[PDB]
Design a protein around this nucleic acid. Sequence first.
RNA 1: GGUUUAGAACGUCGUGAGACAGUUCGGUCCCUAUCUGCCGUGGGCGCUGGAGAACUGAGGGGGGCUGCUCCUAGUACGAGA
Length: 176
Amino acid sequence: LSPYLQEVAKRRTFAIISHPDAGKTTITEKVLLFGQAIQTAGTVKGRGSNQHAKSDWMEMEKQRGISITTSVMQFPYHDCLVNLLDTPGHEDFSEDTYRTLTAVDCCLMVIDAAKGVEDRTRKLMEVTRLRDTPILTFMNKLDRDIRDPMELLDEVENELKIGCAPITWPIGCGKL
RNA sequence: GGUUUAGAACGUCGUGAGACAGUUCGGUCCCUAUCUGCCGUGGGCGCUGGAGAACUGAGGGGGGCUGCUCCUAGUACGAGA
Ligand SMILES: Nc1nc2c(ncn2[C@@H]2O[C@H](COP(=O)(O)OP(=O)(O)NP(=O)(O)O)[C@@H](O)[C@H]2O)c(=O)[nH]1
Ligand SMILES: [Mg+2]
């Protein structure tokens, strides 16, 4: 427990991957307020939640349309020091994302519970198994009317060839 | 202020006086309301002995517009926007 091997062990550096518009960038902004980096928060395109607070999608064109290239982040949560990446969704667009995976020891996949598993979701798992990299799964968008979370588990096991272990479970979806 | 008076000029027409549904500058707009109506306000009598109060409510009138924001929710919808 020397001041060296202690700093090392308390660190944790990970990805965040998605099919385009799943919510990487949003869950990221929220992860940032659980780290006391953003005292308020925002949305995307600076949209529906007002205030010139978008944000932390670096660049510029990102804020005009929707997301471009990996923003990177370091903040403290609980007993750890997290290093957070923000991987772009789009076939032609990255690249980069792939090279970014080279910097992560593990990885979190966001899934649109209203959409299930999409195309670049499937392609991203292939790239993942290249390094036997671990995957956390987050089922985003429970504010929306979604599919049966049972069926959502099938699509994840069947099409992504990986076991599902529910930690939490939604009670009602959409307006409920 | 416009434009159908009287002054004056331009262009135009006519020998001319004058003329143009061409133009230009100037140029007196009265009424103390009797009736109807309408807004208000009293007087009289009626209502069945006379009086002071408080009512019922037939009916009449006034009022009746709308923006933006927030919650639902950036949810339904949408590939997105
Ligand atoms: N209803 C709802 N909408 C969400 C949720 N999370 C994200 N969104 C919406 O989904 C859209 C996609 O946002 P974004 O975070 O850019 O997704 P992304 O995965 O970063 N984009 P990309 O995959 O292109 O990099 C946003 O407009 C945001 O409003 C959620 O939990 N619920
Ligand atoms: Mg993004």
